[PDB]
Ligand binder design. Structure first.
Ligand code: CL
Ligand code: CL
Ligand code: CL
Ligand code: CL
Ligand code: CL
Ligand code: CL
Ligand code: CL
Ligand code: CL
Ligand code: CL
Lengths: 156, 156, 156, 156, 156, 156, 156, 156, 156, 156
């Protein structure tokens, strides 16, 4: 039976505990995802308070971190989502993604309506991934793929 | 001498004109991008006030819309960027991209630091692309690629 | 080719014109919906700047109001939506619906997750209806029906 | 003597305990409502801090959860209401209901004044219910009914 | 058909005109209320954009100010209400009433629930009046009466 | 020596204690006022953190609630006043008074200047009272009297 | 009959005209105050939209600037006061007075309650003066005197 | 070596202790300042978290309050200043000083530039004092003196 | 007599015309500074509304831009300063300077207090310059020098 | 594996400890920087929560303060950066740097586009330095150097 949260505090406190135990055991997010059968972006988001995990995955990650059954039960609950509820990010790393939306937000709207029609690209029927690729200039680039269902607005 | 704007008002008024003339001439954003040698998302963003265009591309787009030499010069100016300066978007289409950042923002930070290191993904050394694909369950999906250079923090 | 707006100013000015002409001609919202084949809530929202109308409906409503082809083209454009972008409403009539959300918002979330699962009730695959009913206590009641698709959040 | 709260902190803390105990005991919101004679939405809202319960109902739900007399006394107090006092929700499930109000808020006002008159649809003399129905595509829909008394504004 | 406003701008502009003409003709608010059969507080609020007037009263006030049929029709339309939509007042005269609410707001809630019960004192089924009385210490006092219907919150 | 607070936290914590003890003893606000010689609204506001009480009254109310000398000393200290410092109220009961000010705020200013002159109605040389009347339409009404000294603004 | 404003726009527009005409005639604020019989701070505040002037003073100031009777009548109206309604000042000169309040605001409250009692120092029964003094260490100092009536808070 | 704070929390907690011990010992702000050789406004501000005290004065006031050497070391640290960081004050006593700036802020700017020139009146090279004077019309007045150095803005 | 502005609108409108005329004549900011005898950063800031220019410099730059005597007089007026009064910048170029303050703001305070003492680094007795330097590792760097007088906070 | 923070709370609590221990041992920021091989501004920012330290440097600074291995591990984690996430600073020392951005922000943008081109000055590839210089007029000045890489916008 699915349980849900009405406030962020319990799952943010669990995320605090994950960050601490992960650092103490010198673990990576990839290591916590290994063996769950789920995607790196989904499992990491769940541990940071933004998704529930299915029971089997929750128990797997909880064993790796040394978390108990109470923690696993909480990880399986549907959270109250939002990773920056208290204002636009000040952190440069997070801010750049907001800046991408500032520069291209109106473009995304315009091109969605041209290429698809009236409606939205879903954030729920939706997958996200990030990959590192080499830049021909020698550096590296992050390629973030947003893959969302088009939901049309139809007259009724 | 490259020129720049100190306020959004002139380029937003020019964007207003573009929207109106594009509708009057029944044009697409793709048609305005055709012949510029630049990508759809970049030219559309420029027309909506978020990038300068080089002189050649500015003159081509202005020719298609019936805009004069003053408009083309304004289009070649460096703008004061930002497509939603007056609050989080209320428009559902733009809001969904903000929601993606709310759910995955902390995950993106965590995975950038794991896969790249301390630093940022650029929003200016940056490419944006939208593809429309078929949805297996019926309908269509948008696959949006954000491609940004990794810039490391420099200890000093 | 479908056209879209990047700012609210043009459609809000058209809505201003609609309000003025509707009053001068002593028309009702029901009369403006009559003959479109569309629902009262959808057509009224479109006229107030929150939806595009298809060409045939746009042409019919503009005929009743005495609006020209430029207005009809604008009415057919996809708007930048949001009926209160400048803060929580002060108007008592609109505020009561906001108050309903303040009192029951956490309940709606909890019961959606219990009866449907993780995910959302859609605001896009969505229909709205308002009915007037006579109250046994004397007077009347409004029965507002929100009818939205459940979109599940699935692990990936 | 009926008692009331002047701050949200105690009832939010009680709601915290309800969420935790219902998860620990594998109870549903419907299970807690059973036997109170009150509607699911009302009892759930009360437990989440937005209504008082009558003594009989409060003792019923507290008995199921293992909460003591101090908790039941607090549940019987009139709360300081508001389920999102610290900003527009970031949670997608809650946000969609806010978005419905952004798109249709001005329409609701217009149609209330046309069909009822000057005045408001009450959020106090008011009932809310949520029903799950099938969608033809094999999924499901939520039909949320808002049923409020019309209170007229009359000259004085 | 009763008409309504969706934006404040037309009625605020009409209020602007009223203020200017009132000053030019050396009129009082009492003089504009005289002959309408309505209360000073209601007619004054209507002229300042916060209520509609019935046709007869609207034509009378409009006659005293020299306003035409267009102004009178607008005065008869249901407004989008709110006399300070852009922040807490800075004006000392209005601010003091806000301060009374800051000092006594929690007291009013506490005493309403004790003397009436759970529910609200209505701002819609509501009358306001201001009286001037001589202060025994010299000077004068304003006695402002707020007279609102108690609307109970009952379980459903 | 009269003492004063620089932060709300201690008196808000004392108010928390008052609410809890009042509920445990099934007391009314009227019972706490009885025997102090002061008005219900003043004593209630003091206990909710918005006024100091004189020593005699502070000792009487503390005796009824079971509060010690430390609580009484704090009740005698001048508070940092303000019953909603963190935003416009979400609670329906408190909000209605704010709405009253939104609708009639500009009217109150206009009528004060007409009937008194330039200046303010005091929130300091000020008395507040709430009375219940059993209204012929069935139910009851609250009659709230705001009684404030007129303080004129004079050239200097 | 004393007239009053409900919006700042007319007096801000008059203030714009004053500033422009003052610059064209190379006048000082002191020259505009000369002959009115009123204080420099009061007349300057009036011209900047924050006080009404008496008829005789309004006429004298209007004659020196070349302003007409419409301007004088508006200058005699009671304004909607507030010189920074749109946020904390960014201007360094005004900001320093705000900073004085940030550093010493809690001290001013504490010392008012110690030296006077519970209550306020009036901003209405109030005089402001600024004086220039030479600094013994070279340069000059501004001595700004705030002179306000103590209004006590008394139990009722 | 001079120490400094980067967050307000420690000095606000110390100010909390000062307020409590001052009340327990029935001391005045004047009594705490007397014997330090410093001005009442400076020492009171320091104790409320807004200035560091020199070692000799810090130990003297700590001796009067019964505070230990840890507290004195904290009182000697340069604070992160600001007595209302969380919004415009709601407290009437503090608010009147803010209202004074709302009414006269633009006047102060205007007269500073006239009597001194471009630049600022300093809030750092600055002294404040408060003086109680008797009012001829019965009662008392506060005379608050702000005394700041003029720092000119010169072209460079 | 030195003149000053009380609102930003005139100088922002003048800045608008500067930007437009500078682009039409294809001028550089350096070209506008040449011949004034003043620094590039000061003259540019003046033209963008943030400083007054001396008469001779104002007349020189106005001659180069084709602005008339009215514009020069406005350029000689002391402005109401602030280049982003309407929120944190969205433009990436301006935002980075804000981001440096976000990252290093607490460090600047700490190191100012250690190296200088209690007090401030002045923004008024202050010079700014920006210089382009080659980066030893490739590309270019901007070196922005902030040169401000230390003003100590001393006890009084 | 590099670790990162998702919330500011742990590194802000460590900064609290650093400040306390630094004062207790009467240390300077320079003494904490000595031996790290890093610059004063970088190490100080790291200790205040704004940068990770390399292991060697983290261990050295922890040895000077009496901090354990948990503190050092935390200092090596990439922080969620931002030294004023809860509003514009009230602290005068910090505020002056914000004020320099208010006065010169548009100038910096303008001159970056003139001297470098379209793009930004980095806050990430960035060095900060403070120098104390004696003022000829008596006293001292801070010469603060901001040294950031120019990052060009890449059209695509
Ligand atoms: Cl969605
Ligand atoms: Cl949706
Ligand atoms: Cl209601
Ligand atoms: Cl109501
Ligand atoms: Cl008052
Ligand atoms: Cl006052
Ligand atoms: Cl200063
Ligand atoms: Cl300064
Ligand atoms: Cl950067």
């Amino acid at each position: 039976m699915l349980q849900s949260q009405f406030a962020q505090t319990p799952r943010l406190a669990l995320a605090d505990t994950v960050i601490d135990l992960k650092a103490r055991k010198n673990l990576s997010w990839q290591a916590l995802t290994d063996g769950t059968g789920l995607s790196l972006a989904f499992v990491t988001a769940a541990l940071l308070g933004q998704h529930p995990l299915p029971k089997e995955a929750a128990d797997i990650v909880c064993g790796k971190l040394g978390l108990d059954e109470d923690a696993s039960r909480l990880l399986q609950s549907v959270p109250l989502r939002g990773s920056f509820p208290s204002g636009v990010p000040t952190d440069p790393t997070m801010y750049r993604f907001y800046e991408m939306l500032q520069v291209y937000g109106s473009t995304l709207k315009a091109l969605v309506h041209e290429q698809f029609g009236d409606g939205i690209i879903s954030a729920i029927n939706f997958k996200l991934d990030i990959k590192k690729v080499e830049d021909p200039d020698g550096g590296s680039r992050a390629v973030i793929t947003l893959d969302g269902k088009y939901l049309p607005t139809k007259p009724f």
